[PDB]
Amino acid sequence: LLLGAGESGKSTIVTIQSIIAIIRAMGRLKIDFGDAARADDARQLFVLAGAAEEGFMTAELAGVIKRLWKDSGVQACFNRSREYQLNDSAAYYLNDLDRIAQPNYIPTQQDVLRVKTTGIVETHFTFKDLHFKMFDVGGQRSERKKWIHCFEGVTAIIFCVALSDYDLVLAEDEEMNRMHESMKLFDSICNNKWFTDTSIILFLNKKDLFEEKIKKSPLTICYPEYAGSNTYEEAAAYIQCQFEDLNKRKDTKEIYTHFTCATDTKNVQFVFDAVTDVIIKNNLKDCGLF
Amino acid sequence: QLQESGQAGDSLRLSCAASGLIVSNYAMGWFRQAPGKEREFVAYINWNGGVTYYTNSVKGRFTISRDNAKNTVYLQMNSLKPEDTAVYYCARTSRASVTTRVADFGYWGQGTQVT
Amino acid sequence: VQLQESGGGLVQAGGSLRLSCAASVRTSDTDGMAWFRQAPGKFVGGIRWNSATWYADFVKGRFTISRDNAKNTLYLQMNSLKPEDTALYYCARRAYGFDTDSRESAYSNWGQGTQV
Amino acid sequence: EPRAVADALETGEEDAVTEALRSFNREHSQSFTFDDAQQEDRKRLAKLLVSVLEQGLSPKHRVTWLQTIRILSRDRSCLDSFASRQSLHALACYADIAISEEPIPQPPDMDVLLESLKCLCNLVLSSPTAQMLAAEARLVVRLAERVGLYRKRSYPHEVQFFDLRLLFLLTALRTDVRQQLFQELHGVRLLTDALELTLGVAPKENPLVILPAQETERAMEILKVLFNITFDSVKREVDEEDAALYRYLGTLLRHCVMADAAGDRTEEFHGHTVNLLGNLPLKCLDVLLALELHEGSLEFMGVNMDVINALLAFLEKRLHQTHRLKECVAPVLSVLTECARMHRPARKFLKAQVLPPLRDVRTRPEVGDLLRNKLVRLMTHLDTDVKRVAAEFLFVLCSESVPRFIKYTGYGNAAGLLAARGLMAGGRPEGQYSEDEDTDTEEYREAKASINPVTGRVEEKPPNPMEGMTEEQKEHEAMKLVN
Amino acid sequence: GLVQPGGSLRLSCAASGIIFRSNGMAWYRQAPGKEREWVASITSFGDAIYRDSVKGRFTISRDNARNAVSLQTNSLKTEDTAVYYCNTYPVNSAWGQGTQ
Amino acid sequence: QLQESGGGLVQAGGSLRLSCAASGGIVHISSMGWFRQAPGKQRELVATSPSNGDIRYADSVKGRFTLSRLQMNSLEPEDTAVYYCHSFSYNNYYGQGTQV
């Protein structure tokens, strides 16, 4: 089966409010590109947030929220906000909200009033074996299905994560980094007396976002102990050896480590994207100074 | 640590083996070595007897089998000629290619010489 | 947030060096780090919300002001023949930032110490 | 003094200037010239030499003055004064490589020509201004004229090697002139006739060809040029006549790959040949099989396989380079996949060679010194663009069948679960590619209880169900659902 | 020239200007118009590449230390009666005269 | 490993006798010079006297020097730089020195 996060696309294996965070994203984007009295807006966005407003928005500050969106530079910052995982239908939510600021308002397309969740399978796939397959991302297995019917002896467990997100913090008012918390609960996963010898297949999704977010240096708060170079290979070997050696069973277990490209099925990323570039580089620097 | 036993054009058996307490599940290899001349590769037999190889003057009369279970090779020296008087090291490469003429692998045996 | 400064240069009207105002844990994203008029009587760091790291308003100094978010510290250079590199090194940690507004406000705290 | 050369040029007595430049030429012709007194007190000398390069210099002392030009071009901090528009004009005009002065020159001897060639490659290696100005000035049409004018011109190795090296530098730096030479001049055609002239040394052609060092390094540099120009968006770009030209290059590479370079250039020769062999049209690839029966030939399934066995030997020889893999091991593996996948004797031959060494049935699927074990250990390497290559290789050599793949690979789920969408549905189907359901030995006995992702050791007996369930033991969902 | 279907002749007209050693000769064919297609070519030694519709029927010969370039196609249908041409492969010089 | 011993007197208007000795043992040095590294620019060639005939002083000033087969004479208050000897057969055998 496959445990893991909700941020690596698990289907590959097969009244709504609270999106005002671009002000924290653009402030963390190293370019001051405001368009109005922005301190009168986002603080107004923190004027009465946190509880139930007069609707999902309210016509007082829905005006200034649409004014914040009226900055097209804020839309440029949102379009550049790869390191700011907001809601993927934020433009859809904004187009609903600008038509929703007037009263007697209801949208009817993203959710049905009476949703997409990964959920359960417990399927048989019958591929010349038995091959149980299961997922645990929901907290729905907290009623009387506590890891059903003593189903252990799991032939493989899966702990996938993406590594290019630690500077963005889930738990509020802290900077407890995401990879730091992932290697926190991996210690509760591995040393446990359930899955003692079986394969801890440790996926590592999203290679390219790491490859282009290593320009953010790896010594800010993520690994304040030590840091190698800024190249992908040494940092990847560093995090791999770290996460592998965190397992207290170093030799009796047989940890399987992998790496992958996220969504590129096309053959242009097989030899044509980077391999020919490296061969060109070495054929160039294999010569000169005559 | 290999070893194997040994007037007209005659048929002669040469049942080389792994009987020198030898692990040989890789591809084996035969070698002539005449007095004064260096080592001469003649026979390449892969496991399961699939591919075969001879040099340009041994192919038609010196066929060679392989009982790959017992890791033994049975050589049928048919129609003996004046190019018989070479010592013969059974050998076994450790590569994955039909590699000729280079002595890139040990286990060179003790070597037998036909009379 | 409740932080003190030090640093400065040499007392010869030629002391060109660094100054160190080291913060507590971080400066908030709806905040910043700045300073006041930079004398104990008769404003070096024109840092701002994100990137408008401006210069001195009433002094027009050559102060190579810099902060270190990776080190939670403002490392400023009150250099280049500073006769306005006096004692009361006010560095102000902020709670809001618009335009490097170094005019005795825009500060969650007012640091205290010396310089040179 | 060589410092005083710049002051002796000011008076400009001809014997003093020429003799001081001559002795300075034979002294400082080496790489990495003067260290202190040149960035302040030879840039003046560089300025005056650029100024005298501007006028056409006298018919004598040309080798000396252009050798001084080359020597000052060896340093880093004089390219800013030696890499201007009119300086490049003068150096091309003495180089006879610009189309601005093509019907002009009285027939030049090759010495000053190759000297100017050396100055040109020295500048174009390390001036991006010269990159811009070469893409501006379009030297490559006269360079193509020079490389096409070889079967009638007796131009030796030095001039030949050096101007196609200049071509290699310009095609390494400027992709606009890359595609310009690709479409606009049929550079693959001109490079194929250049390759025919390099191979035409006739090195006992009926046995294996043996190219000597000079023409060997020419073929190596023109193969660098060919790999420089051959890659760009060619992956499914098929034409009949262009495929015929690609097929001529393919059969020429077929005759070339089983060779041996002089000295010690054979490994890099083989690597550059297979680099050129890599990115071709895959439908045009299977001509590698197109080899006749012969004496001394590894005949398998009735067909020749000698070049495939030779490149497999090259793969095993190349795999040991652990410092730089993705240059050295990727293109042979990809071309071996594509030639294996388009031919049933190829697939059957490599599927009979590298896979069916089974391991000793106990130990783990990654320990062992066999080539299969090497590829298994390579598949988990942190380079994605070799791990996908080896995964595709073992999949397409495993006859496109997942239960065959898991029957010798434990991490193959993590390999092919993303290659196809999980691979546990209809995709990479049951083999019409011969493929019968009977691969066998005395194995699979332990695989009657095939605990598959590990090698299958039956020692899984800690139960630990001490009391009930989940009691501080599997109530870890309370920190999980946020994740 | 109006050949009865089933055989042909060794064509063998010599080129004009260069030597037939390490200069790969070839053959082109052309229906009576612009439409002209390459037939076959031979490398530095006797390695002859072919099109699909010339497989088995057509033999090409560079024939080194012999003068011409001989071509023995056999078992011809009525779908070859067109004009052919002969020149070097890696450089296409001025053409010859033509085949009736 | 070739190194030096370049000190430096932190006071205006005086002499500077510095040293740059041979430790690395590599042949073909033959010319020991200087550099002036002011705190706001590139390092500046001053005592370029290669022991190859006649010495050559500072291009800017005439603070008089010598070479040790050094002694910088009559400094000024403002012409301040991070001083280094400079021998070379590789390129940059600077060594380490001080400033005033």
CSV table of N, CA, C and O in Angstrom, one decimal, chain D residues 81 105 160 231 271 273 328 343 392 483:
chain,number,residue,atom,x,y,z
D,81,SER,N,40.2,44.1,-26.3
D,81,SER,CA,40.7,44.9,-27.3
D,81,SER,C,41.0,44.1,-28.6
D,81,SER,O,41.1,44.7,-29.7
D,105,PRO,N,41.8,37.1,-52.8
D,105,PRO,CA,43.2,36.8,-52.4
D,105,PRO,C,44.0,36.0,-53.4
D,105,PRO,O,43.5,35.0,-54.0
D,160,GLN,N,43.4,21.7,-41.7
D,160,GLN,CA,42.1,21.0,-41.7
D,160,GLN,C,41.4,20.9,-40.4
D,160,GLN,O,40.3,21.4,-40.1
D,231,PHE,N,21.5,16.9,-33.0
D,231,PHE,CA,20.5,16.6,-32.0
D,231,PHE,C,19.2,17.4,-32.1
D,231,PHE,O,18.2,16.9,-31.6
D,271,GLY,N,33.3,6.4,-27.8
D,271,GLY,CA,32.3,7.2,-27.1
D,271,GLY,C,31.8,8.3,-28.0
D,271,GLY,O,30.6,8.5,-28.0
D,273,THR,N,31.7,8.1,-31.4
D,273,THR,CA,30.9,7.4,-32.4
D,273,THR,C,29.5,7.0,-31.8
D,273,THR,O,28.5,7.2,-32.5
D,328,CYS,N,28.6,9.1,-20.2
D,328,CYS,CA,29.3,8.0,-20.7
D,328,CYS,C,28.4,6.8,-21.0
D,328,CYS,O,28.7,6.0,-21.9
D,343,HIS,N,13.6,-5.5,-33.1
D,343,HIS,CA,14.1,-6.7,-33.8
D,343,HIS,C,14.0,-7.8,-32.8
D,343,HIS,O,14.6,-7.8,-31.7
D,392,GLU,N,13.9,1.5,-18.5
D,392,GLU,CA,13.4,1.2,-19.8
D,392,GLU,C,14.1,0.1,-20.5
D,392,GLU,O,13.5,-0.7,-21.2
D,483,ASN,N,-1.2,15.9,7.1
D,483,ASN,CA,-0.3,15.5,6.0
D,483,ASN,C,-1.1,14.9,4.9
D,483,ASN,O,-2.1,14.3,5.1
